[PDB]
Amino acid sequence: PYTEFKEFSRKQIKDMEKMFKQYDAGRDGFIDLMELKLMMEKLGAPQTHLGLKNMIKEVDEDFDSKLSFREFLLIFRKAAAGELQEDSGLCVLARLSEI
Ligand SMILES: [Zn+2]
Ligand SMILES: [Zn+2]
Ligand SMILES: [Zn+2]
């Protein structure tokens, strides 16, 4: 992931790994819908059921309906590129994280 996401410092990615481990509650290397629900609540920005789904859908490049750490980094790639909507749960997740 350091090799691929060269637009991010090592400091940044590690902060994103920390966030990812923090909310991957089952500790199985993915963030599922339920996990993302709790995360957006913990961040103070709960999202609607369908909003959670599109969050995942937008960066779920392997269609497994879960988020891999690779797809978590896509959130931040997409956001830094200016590609997300602004009311969008993905943008909200990114701006509420502390990266
Ligand atoms: Zn998980
Ligand atoms: Zn549903
Ligand atoms: Zn996926």
Residue numbers in the entry: 82 to 180
Paper text:
EFhd1Zn, EFhd2Zn and EFhd1Ca comprised two EF-hands, a ligand mimic (LM) helix at the C-terminus, a PR region at the N-terminus and a C-terminal linker. In addition, we determined that EFhd1 and EFhd2 bind actin independently of Ca2+ or Zn2+ and also exhibit Ca2+-dependent and Zn2+-dependent actin-bundling activity.
Thereafter, ZnCl2 was added to the protein solution to a final concentration of 0.75 mM. At a wavelength near the Zn K-edge (λ = 1.2851 Å/9648 eV), the Ca2+ f″ and Zn2+ f″ were 0.9 and 0.5 electrons, respectively. For that reason, we cannot rule out the possibility that the anomalous signals for EFhd2Zn originated from Ca2+, because the wavelength for the EFhd2Zn data collection was near the Zn K-edge [Fig. 1(g)]. We used a single EFhd2Zn crystal to collect datasets at the peak and remote positions of the Zn K-edge, which are termed EFhd2Zn(P) or EFhd2Zn(R), respectively. After calculation of the anomalous difference maps for each dataset, the anomalous difference map for EFhd2Zn(R) was subtracted from that for EFhd2Zn(P) to calculate the ΔAno map. The peak heights of the ΔAno map calculated from EFhd2Zn(P) and EFhd2Zn(R) were 11.1 and 9.3σ in EF1 and EF2, respectively [Figs. 1(h) and 1(i)]. In addition, we confirmed that Zn2+ mediates crystal-packing interactions between EFhd2 molecules, which raises the possibility of the involvement of Zn2+-mediated multimerization in AD.
